[PDB]
């Protein structure tokens, strides 16, 4: 299999002019300075950019590129996108269960894994965890071996590496490339780009393309690249790396001067006479949701210190509120206490949902490369990770608050009023978490969104009803009291709990209330805050929250759907 | 001047064994892998580590190292520690104002700087801003040119660069090193270390020391370093970097095998016969506090988007609280609103002072390198930057919250109560800021301290008196209500504001209160919260916060004083 590209004018600003060449099965290479097209000609030939900038044609063996080009070729990201909490056996099963056909047996699927991991020489680390901040794992020299094998699953004809040596040691990098040249003799074409190689690296290549500042400066065999620049009018001294010598000519021991020398080359015409010789989903839905939710759940178990910690904080802050507010008294101070803790329990659900920004932001570079390669659909990605991360880690702490503080404080001692409180803190937990997915989706930085979640809640906190009284806001602001998540929770806990209570000892007020301005029953507190007494007035909040969940997750759906994928 | 070191055994685990060599005036370089001693031999010879680990001697021209060695030598950090928001003219005046004595004239000191900046060739950027993220500044190839001149102010004989090429471009670094060889012929003994140089770099050296894994593996003239290893048993091919060839030996084309080869050298024996021939504050306190506070004040004005922003945040949020709580009524809802806004103001002062963690953490490596260089005292650093950054950026928002909302809300319209509220928000802003310096100072990460500031406030917030009633906590938790900064401000604001008020319209209650459980006056709200009515009870809160400033800044001082400076 060979590539052949011709007359590409890529723009966003044309940062490419006209680049020509074939790529034989061997060791194709792209060298140059980081400002040039060493990372942009690669993404064009790997179909990773916008096709609107594309001008020329990219042909395979006489055939132009189909839409099956991505599923028939492997691209490997510069940094590792591997699941550092899964083992290499687990990741290669995950890649196999989403890319290969469903007709294959697991006994067929395991052997295809077993050939690859032996081809990578990874039998000694075959069940070792890869490595996280909190788990000692396999060294960085074989994380790169893992990621290449993730794209060796389909056994493609064409491989795309992006900087396979940047980030490793020099003794590490030769071990990677010697493995690659052994792949090159098997018939798999390898296309990569190295930042500043060594002569021990450069002695192994089979074809070289030297790019700088959007101009093709060399194309041909890498052995004849040094002798070309000897015949170009330069001299390479003794004991010098030729790859350093190639970038030495770039910076002046000028760009358009050196390109025109390449125009009059015998290597250019041989490329020119060759390019005219040639010129003239897979898997169903429910299967995708099974393996994706399986993956993120082991990620949730495999990183305990981000998930156990939210349980421990919930228990400890559960007990302290249980200790401070120990059994509440039906006296004049009872209204201040009961409306205090219910304001603390609702707002605790909101501000602890700022950690849900971490959900799609850290997974973003993994989300993009898996979707362009097409392991799943976006609708299948979204319903899985909601089921795996968001759904259990919010059901748990809302029960832990509910089990601890309810009978220590001594709230309304009925059957349903225990469960209505439990259900309410569950709903307000999702709604604040859904707003986090509404904002944090698509962005790549954490601190801008983590700021912005803090901004939105402290305005929602004002209108909740404890700081300001919601009946006496000026009328051109009292429509903002509908846009706040914590109001609907805090109203529901107030409606659940202040019904049959009394707060003036010695004074039966629920038949007649002489001497008013008194607030001697729960209703007179509950009306003065502007809250309905009907049983609809309870459940009006829950349908108000549930509508906010569906809207915010839809916004969370579409922002992943319309993202700049290229 | 010459260095000479002999028989160094440094420990923390002995990651150095026995290293011997002199460093003549010329260009002294240290190569090797990053795990070896290329970063730790430099810190020993520049007196930057603990002398409790050091064993061998360091001699200079026949004399051991005095206490004046940290002031008569220049050490240059790897990354830039320069004030990126100032200019190069102002930075070199800052280094001159704290190292040269007070005898010299400003005419004398500026000519010395003109000697430097003409020698560095920075005439075209002599009055240009250096560079931040928010300011387009001088290029990274000349920030390094700026920082080296900061140590050239005393015109020292001995220079210590730490990786002067790492981070620059390859064509960028040749401009730096050719300057250094032009510095070398002035007679300045230049000592540094390079992560993997180039042969265009390596041809400029004068003396070379190869270290790996705590063992001296070569030390001599850099010209013969290639010729020594051909006699060792290794062959260097043509078109190969000699510097990369040296680390190729380290990784095996073993450590103790190659080390004893160097002990039996003809070069080690010439070195061994050389050592035995040789062997056998500055400025007043008031002057320092000017220039430290002067530099950081320009840093405050030179970064608008971190300082002008908090003015904008103050005014905008100040208008919103002015809009929601527009003029407060003296009715039954009036108590809930007035205690609502006053709770929002005191916690807005506390929770926004988490930004003070940025103060001592970002400037930490500049603080450490300067104090070893001894530009100032730790007493002088700490009193200056508080006078420069913390003092004005907390006086401003407490006035703007005071000026805007006090007449939109229509609080108690007397002369003093405007200023008692103004003073109260200022102290609680300092008290929370002092706690932030009490935690942040000494740590190097932002996020761990920022999370710990977040946990400390939400427990202080419960005890403030709005959520729980303070007089009904059980008595074995009620001792905790004194540790809480938002209690003291909020207690003071409630005392400033509920004194001469009434809240049952039509009902004079201040002579007699019939029909109790009423809260018909400001005292009855104020006593039921557990707050004194005597004018001591107000100011008790201010002398409480004034003590918490003095305690926390002291803890902040001692953590800076007892820091591991090495």
């Amino acid at each position, epitope marked *: 299999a060979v590539l052949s590209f011709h007359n590409i004018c890529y723009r966003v600003k044309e940062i490419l002019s006209n680049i020509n060449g074939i790529m034989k099965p061997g060791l194709n290479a792209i060298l140059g300075p980081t400002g040039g097209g060493k990372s942009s000609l690669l993404d064009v030939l790997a179909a990773r950019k916008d096709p609107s900038g594309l001008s020329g044609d990219v042909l395979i063996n006489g055939a132009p590129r189909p839409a099956n080009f991505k599923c028939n070729s492997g691209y490997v990201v510069q940094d590792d996108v591997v699941m550092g909490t899964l083992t290499v056996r687990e990741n290669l099963q995950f890649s196999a269960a989403l890319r290969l056909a469903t007709t294959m047996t697991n006994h067929e699927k395991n052997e295809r894994i077993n050939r690859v991991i032996q081809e990578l020489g990874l039998d000694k680390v075959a069940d070792s965890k890869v490595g996280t901040q909190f788990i000692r794992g396999v060294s960085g020299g074989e994380r790169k071996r893992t990621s290449i094998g993730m794209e060796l699953i389909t056994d493609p004809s064409i491989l795309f590496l992006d900087e396979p040596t940047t980030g490793l040691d020099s003794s590490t990098a030769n071990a990677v490339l010697l493995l690659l040249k052994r792949m090159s003799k098997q018939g798999r074409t390898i296309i990569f780009s190295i930042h500043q190689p060594r002569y021990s690296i450069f002695k192994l290549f089979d074809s070289l393309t030297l790019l700088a500042s959007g101009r093709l400066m060399f194309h041909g065999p890498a052995q004849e690249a040094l002798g070309y620049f000897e015949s170009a009018g330069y001299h390479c001294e003794a004991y010098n790396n030729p790859a350093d010598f190639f970038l030495d000519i770039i910076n002046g021991d000028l760009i358009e001067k050196l390109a025109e020398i390449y125009v009059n080359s015998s290597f250019y015409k041989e490329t020119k006479a060759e390019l005219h010789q040639l010129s003239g989903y897979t898997t169903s839905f429910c299967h995708q949701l099974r393996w994706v939710s399986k993956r993120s759940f082991k990620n949730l178990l495999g990183n305990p210190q981000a998930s156990i910690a939210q349980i421990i904080v919930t228990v400890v802050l559960g007990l302290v509120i249980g200790a401070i507010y120990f059994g509440l008294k039906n006296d004049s101070t009872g209204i201040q206490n009961r409306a205090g803790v219910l304001f603390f329990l609702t707002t605790n659900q909101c501000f602890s949902s700022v950690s849900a920004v971490e959900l799609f932001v850290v997974e973003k570079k993994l989300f993009i490369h898996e979707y362009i390669s097409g392991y799943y659909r976006v609708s299948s990605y979204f319903l899985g990770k909601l089921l795996s991360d968001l759904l259990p880690m919010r059901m748990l702490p809302s029960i832990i608050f509910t089990c601890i503080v309810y009978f220590m404080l001594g709230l309304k001692p009925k059957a349903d009023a225990f469960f209505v409180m439990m259900f309410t803190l569950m709903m307000v937990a999702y709604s604040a978490s859904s707003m986090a997915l509404a904002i944090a989706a698509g962005q790549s930085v954490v601190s801008v969104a983590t700021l912005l979640m803090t901004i939105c809640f402290v305005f929602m906190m004002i209108f909740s009803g404890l700081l300001v009284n919601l*009946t006496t806001i000026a009328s051109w602001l009292s429509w903002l009291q509908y846009f706040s998540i914590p109001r609907y929770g805090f109203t529901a806990l107030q409606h659940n709990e202040f019904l049959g209570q009394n707060f003036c000892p010695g004074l039966n007020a629920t*038949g*007649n*209330n*002489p*001497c*008013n*301005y008194a607030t001697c029953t729960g*209703e*007179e507190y509950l*009306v003065k805050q502007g809250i309905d*007494l009907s049983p609809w007035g309870l459940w009006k909040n829950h349908v108000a929250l549930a509508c906010m969940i569906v809207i915010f997750l839809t916004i969370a759906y579409l922002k992943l759907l319309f993202l700049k994928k290229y | 001047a010459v260095l000479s070191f002999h028989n160094i055994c440094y420990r923390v685990k002995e990651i150095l064994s026995n290293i011997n060599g002199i460093m003549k005036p010329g260009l002294n370089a240290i190569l090797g892998p990053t795990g070896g001693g290329k970063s730790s031999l430099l810190d020993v010879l520049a007196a930057r580590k603990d002398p409790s680990g050091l064993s061998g001697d360091v001699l200079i021209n026949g004399a051991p190292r005095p206490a004046n060695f940290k002031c008569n030598s220049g050490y240059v950090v790897q990354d830039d520690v320069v004030m990126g928001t100032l200019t190069v003219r102002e930075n070199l005046q800052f280094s001159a104002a704290l190292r040269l004595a007070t005898t010299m004239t400003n005419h004398e000191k500026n000519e010395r700087i003109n000697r430097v900046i003409q020698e560095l060739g920075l005439d075209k950027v002599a009055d240009s801003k250096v560079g931040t993220q928010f300011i387009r500044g001088v290029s990274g190839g000349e920030r390094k040119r700026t920082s080296i001149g900061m140590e050239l102010i005393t015109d020292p004989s001995i220079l210590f660069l730490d990786e002067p090429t790492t981070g620059l471009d390859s064509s960028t670094a040749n401009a730096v090193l050719l300057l250094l060889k032009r510095m070398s012929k002035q007679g300045r003994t230049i000592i540094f270390s390079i992560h993997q140089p180039r042969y265009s770099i390596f041809k400029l050296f004068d003396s070379l020391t190869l270290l790996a894994s705590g063992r001296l593996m070569f030390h001599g003239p850099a010209q013969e370093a290639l010729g020594y290893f051909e006699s060792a048993g290794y062959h260097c091919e043509a078109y190969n970097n000699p510097a990369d060839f040296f680390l190729d030996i380290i990784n095996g084309d073993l450590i103790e095998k190659l080390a004893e080869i160097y002990v039996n050298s003809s070069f080690y024996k010439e070195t061994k016969a050389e050592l035995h021939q040789l062997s056998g504050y500055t400025t007043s306190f008031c002057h320092q506090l000017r220039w430290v506070s002067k530099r950081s004040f320009k840093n405050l004005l030179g970064n608008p988007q971190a300082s002008i922003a908090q003015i904008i945040v103050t005014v905008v949020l100040g208008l919103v609280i002015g809009a929601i709580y527009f003029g407060l*009524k*003296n*009715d039954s809802t009036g108590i809930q609103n007035r205690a609502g806004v006053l709770f929002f103001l005191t916690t807005n002062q506390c929770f926004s002072s988490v930004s003070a963690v940025e103060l001592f953490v970002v400037e930490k490596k500049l603080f450490i390198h300067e104090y070893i260089s001894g530009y100032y005292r730790v007493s002088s650093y700490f009193l200056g930057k508080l006078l420069s950054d913390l003092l004005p950026m907390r006086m401003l928002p407490s006035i703007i919250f005071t000026c805007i909302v006090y007449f939109m809300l229509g609080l108690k319209p007397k002369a003093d109560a405007f200023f008692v509220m103004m003073f109260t928000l200022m102290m609680v802003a300092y008290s929370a800021s002092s706690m932030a310096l009490a935690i942040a100072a000494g740590q190097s990460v932002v996020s761990v301290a920022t999370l710990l500031m977040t946990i400390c406030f939400v427990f202080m917030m419960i005890f403030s008196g709005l959520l729980v009633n303070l007089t009904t906590i059980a008595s074995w938790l009620s001792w905790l209500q004194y540790f809480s900064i938002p209690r003291y401000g909020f207690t003071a604001l409630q005392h400033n504001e509920f004194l001469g008020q*009434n809240f*049952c*319209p*039509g*009902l*004079n209650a201040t002579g007699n209160n*019939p*029909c109790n459980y*009423a809260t018909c006056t400001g005292e009855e709200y104020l006593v039921k919260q557990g707050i004194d009515l005597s004018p001591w009870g107000l100011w008790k809160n201010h002398v409480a916060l004034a003590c918490m400033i003095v305690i926390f800044l002291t803890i902040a001082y001692l953590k800076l004083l007892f820091l591991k400076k090495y």
Partner: antibody
Framework: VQLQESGPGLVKPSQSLSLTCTVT?????????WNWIRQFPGKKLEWMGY???????TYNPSLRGRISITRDTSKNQFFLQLRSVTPEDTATYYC????????????WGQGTSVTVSS | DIVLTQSPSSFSVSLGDRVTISCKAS??????LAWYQQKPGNAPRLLIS???SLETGFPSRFSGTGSGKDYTLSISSLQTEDVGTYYC?????????FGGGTKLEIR
């Protein structure tokens, strides 16, 4: 306990309106709130606004800016001052008394009638 | 605000008859309701405070039994001097609206 209105029984349109209720038998700075109630023909009563015992006041938001209530504590009087009058509110005006802790309009004036024509 | 409603805007009763006047609110009042009796040519005089209690100066033929939103007033065996006009008042919020008022008659 004992209230009595007094004022002009006729006024030009768009000029002014002034009434005066002189409380005897009690001191108006002592206990109560004091308020004004008007009653249109085709009887629909309508509350206007009160002044507190300590000079504070609260007005009906239907009558924005048109009404202001002041008092003279020297002789137990409190004044209704209604401006920019329309010929629609040719009502019967009352000064009344609000206990606060009982919550009802306990005492009511004799009542005067104001007509706005030309 | 809180608007009030006396949907029986009139009656036509006989002497000694038990009549009942309903007053409907546009919100919760929580027994903060009143009743006034206006003869033709006088000021309104308070009849019932707090929707249950009664004022000194009236016989115990008047009684109010209110709960939640539906407040009512019952006159059992009305005399001749009970003809007139009746009003209901909320004093929960600040713009103290009254009811539209009803006017008893004799056939």
């Amino acid at each position: 306990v004992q209230l009595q209105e007094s004022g002009p029984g006729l006024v030009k349109p768009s000029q002014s309106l002034s009434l005066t209720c002189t409380v005897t038998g009690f001191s108006i700075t002592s206990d109560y709130a004091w308020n004004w109630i008007r009653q249109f023909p085709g009887k629909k009563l309508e509350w206007m606004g009160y002044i507190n015992f300590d000079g504070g006041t609260t007005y009906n938001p239907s009558l924005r800016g048109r009404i202001s209530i002041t008092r003279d504590t020297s002789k137990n009087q409190f004044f209704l001052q209604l401006r920019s009058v329309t010929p629609e509110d040719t009502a019967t005006y009352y000064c009344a008394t609000f206990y606060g802790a009982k919550g009802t309009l306990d005492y009511w004036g004799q009542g005067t009638s104001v007509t706005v024509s030309s | 605000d809180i608007v009030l409603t006396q949907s029986p805007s009139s009656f036509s009763v006989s002497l000694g008859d038990r009549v009942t006047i309903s007053c409907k609110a546009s919100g919760y009042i929580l027994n903060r309701l009143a009743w006034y009796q206006q003869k033709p040519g006088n000021a309104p005089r308070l009849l019932i405070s707090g929707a249950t209690s009664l004022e000194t100066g009236f016989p115990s033929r008047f009684s109010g039994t209110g709960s939640g939103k539906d407040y009512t007033l019952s006159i059992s065996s009305l005399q001749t001097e009970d003809v007139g006009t009746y009003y209901c008042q909320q004093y929960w919020s600040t713009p103290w609206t009254f009811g539209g008022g009803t006017k008893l008659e004799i056939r």
